[PDB]
Curated annotation (Swiss-Prot):
Protein's job: The biological function of streptavidin is not known. Forms a strong non-covalent specific complex with biotin (one molecule of biotin per subunit of streptavidin).
Organism: Streptomyces avidinii
Protein name: Streptavidin
Location within or outside the cell: Secreted
Family statement drawn from the similarity comment of this UniProt entry: Belongs to the avidin/streptavidin family.
Keywords linked to the UniProt accession: Biotin, Secreted, Signal
Superkingdom field: Bacteria
Oligomer status and interactors: Homotetramer.
Length: 123
């Protein structure tokens, strides 16, 4: 469904790679490899998607998180992508992304970045 459409490899506009499996009951699981930031190698990704989307031409809502810790790096931060999958010949996952770093309370006002990421099936 959107299950078949979402499962697989996606590439963002910055050169990052998402490899994700969409489970039949709403789970997203896989890995992320970032082309930017204090990051190297792959990181675990987990999220959710609407496993019964509308059929009226609407996208399929989804989101996921990556905490930026693996065996090679820990940036003490985590990003969440919120967006929708749009299927078909030019499939895309269009997202907004929040990246929060751990901070002191005094620096909490500057703890969270906002950005946007568009993923496509080809590099």
């Amino acid at each position: 469904t959107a299950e078949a459409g979402i499962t697989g490899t996606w590439y963002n506009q910055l050169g990052s790679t998402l490899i994700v499996t969409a489970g039949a009951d709403g789970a997203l699981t896989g890995t992320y490899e970032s082309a930017v930031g204090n990051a190297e190698g792959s990181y675990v990704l987990t999220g959710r998607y609407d496993s019964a989307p509308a059929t009226d031409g609407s996208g399929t809502a989804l989101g996921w998180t990556v905490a930026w810790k693996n065996n090679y790096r820990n940036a003490h931060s985590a990003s969440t992508w919120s967006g929708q999958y749009v299927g078909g010949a030019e499939a895309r996952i269009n997202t907004q992304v929040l990246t929060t770093s751990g901070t002191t309370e005094a620096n909490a006002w500057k703890s969270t970045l906002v950005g946007h990421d568009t993923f496509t099936k080809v590099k």
